């Protein structure tokens, strides 16, 4: 029933920071507002209840404030260990109700993405199916965009990407995208083309290979 | 200290059903409701309902009436939850967590269950060659397509363990035959092409399928 709202969706920030996320809800709920901190493969963790209330352990630096509809929590100097998603959760009224997530990422200077294309192996071949690979390396912010081009012709709904977890050493990100087809459409075109625009590029890089070798 | 411990990650298939349970210790069970929360992969939190263990009082969010079932043994300190008629969309960490005031300090480490018609397969592993030339100057990337398994997960190392840096292993992604598909990834020097051998160790423990994959140029 009561919405929860929150923003922004994804927060970057350094060292250091003070960091501020909002949640919004959509009916009255008093001050039954609880934050959690959430880190990959772990359940949520309790910083804050009762829309202000530091949880017992947690660090001094986390507060929250609000009432009504408008919340927020508060991280006054960000430390390495918070880069993390954070929810909202509303205990007025069942159903209980959460927010859909702010993650915390570390801001660093734009990198553009070394990008590196594979046409499928001849191993791969000999069962009927052809996986090409697109790799984007090191690249920051998140936000990247591959385009398949097959002679020319755009590629679109036979491919699917994913993307690495922020890196803790250089706090980069890397994305693979597999292009699949059938041998048989694979053998019928020359030209494979993987096209990465990222705002750490002026313009589109374009890596490609004609099959048969060279 | 309060722990809740829960059972481990279920396989079903669809139209099945899966009673998962978590343990309570260091704390007064039938003093605390046991609370369950859904999160669906890649996605937020859902509250499915709540049990109290002194005489069972359950409430439910409605959106769960029919799904889910929460019961409890008191004599054993555990909560059992309960979802029926399997869906793909039923695919999700299931946690419990203590609810005495209004909110949730002590949580279960979550059960994953995956709901898929799809058969347990090893995969094949093949070779993302490090390319002839290009780049942007001496690095070349090489890595392994580990394709058609299920389920997860898979593990990938390099030169067993002896190569980390520049390693990148990616999420695998779920292709529409119900199958997983995963690449592995590193950076190294080219000039270290002609003398390093380069080797991807496969683990795909539920098929009991381990590969080695030795990847070297050769594509133009």
């Known amino acids: 029933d009561i919405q929860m709202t929150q923003s922004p969706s994804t927060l970057s920030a350094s060292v250091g920071d003070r960091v501020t996320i909002t949640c919004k809800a959509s009916?009255?709920?008093?001050?039954?507002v609880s934050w959690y901190q959430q880190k990959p493969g772990k359940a949520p963790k309790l910083l804050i209840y009762?829309?202000?209330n530091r949880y017992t352990g947690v660090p001094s630096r986390f507060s929250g404030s609000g009432s009504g509809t408008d919340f927020t929590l508060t991280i006054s100097s960000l430390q390495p260990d918070d880069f993390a998603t954070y929810y909202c959760?509303?205990?007025?009224?069942?159903?209980?109700?959460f927010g859909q997530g702010t993650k915390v990422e570390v801001k660093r200077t734009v990198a553009a993405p070394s990008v590196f294309i594979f046409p499928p192996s001849d191993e791969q071949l000999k069962s009927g199916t052809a996986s090409v690979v697109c790799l984007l390396n090191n690249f920051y912010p998140r936000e990247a965009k591959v385009q398949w081009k097959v002679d020319n012709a755009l590629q679109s709904g036979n491919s699917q990407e994913s993307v690495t977890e922020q890196d803790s050493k250089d706090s980069t990100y890397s994305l693979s995208s597999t292009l699949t087809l059938s041998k048989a459409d694979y053998e019928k075109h020359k030209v494979y083309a993987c096209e990465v625009t990222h705002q750490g590029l002026s313009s589109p890089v374009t890596k490609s290979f004609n099959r048969g070798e060279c | 200290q309060v722990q809740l411990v829960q059972s481990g990650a279920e396989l079903k298939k669809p139209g099945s059903s899966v009673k998962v349970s978590c343990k309570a210790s260091?704390?007064?069970?039938?003093?605390?409701?046991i609370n369950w929360v859904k999160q669906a992969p890649g996605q937020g939190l859902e509250w499915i309902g709540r049990?109290?263990?002194?005489?069972?009082?359950?409430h439910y969010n409605q959106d769960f009436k029919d799904k889910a079932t929460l019961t409890v043994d008191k004599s054993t300190n555990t909560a059992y939850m309960e979802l029926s008629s399997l869906r793909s969309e039923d695919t999700a960490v299931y946690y419990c967590?203590?609810?005495?005031?209004?909110?949730?300090?002590?949580w279960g480490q979550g059960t994953l269950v995956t709901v898929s018609s799809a058969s347990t397969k090893g995969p094949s592993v093949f070779p993302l060659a490090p390319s002839s030339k290009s780049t942007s100057g001496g690095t070349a990337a090489l890595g392994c397509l580990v394709k058609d398994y299920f389920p997860e997960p898979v593990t990938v190392s390099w030169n067993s363990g002896a190569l980390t840096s520049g390693v990148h292993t990616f999420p695998a992604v779920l292709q529409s035959s119900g199958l997983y598909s995963l690449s592995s990834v590193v950076t190294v020097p080219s000039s270290s092409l002609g003398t390093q051998t380069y080797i991807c160790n496969v683990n795909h423990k539920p098929s009991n399928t381990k590969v080695d994959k030795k990847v070297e140029p050769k594509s133009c």
């Open positions: 260091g704390y007064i069970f039938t003093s605390s409701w």
């Open positions: 049990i109290d263990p002194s005489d069972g009082e359950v």
């Open positions: 009762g829309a202000s």
């Open positions: 967590a203590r609810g005495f005031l209004p909110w949730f300090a002590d």
């Open positions: 009916e009255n709920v008093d001050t039954y």
């Open positions: 959760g509303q205990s007025y009224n069942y159903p209980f109700t």
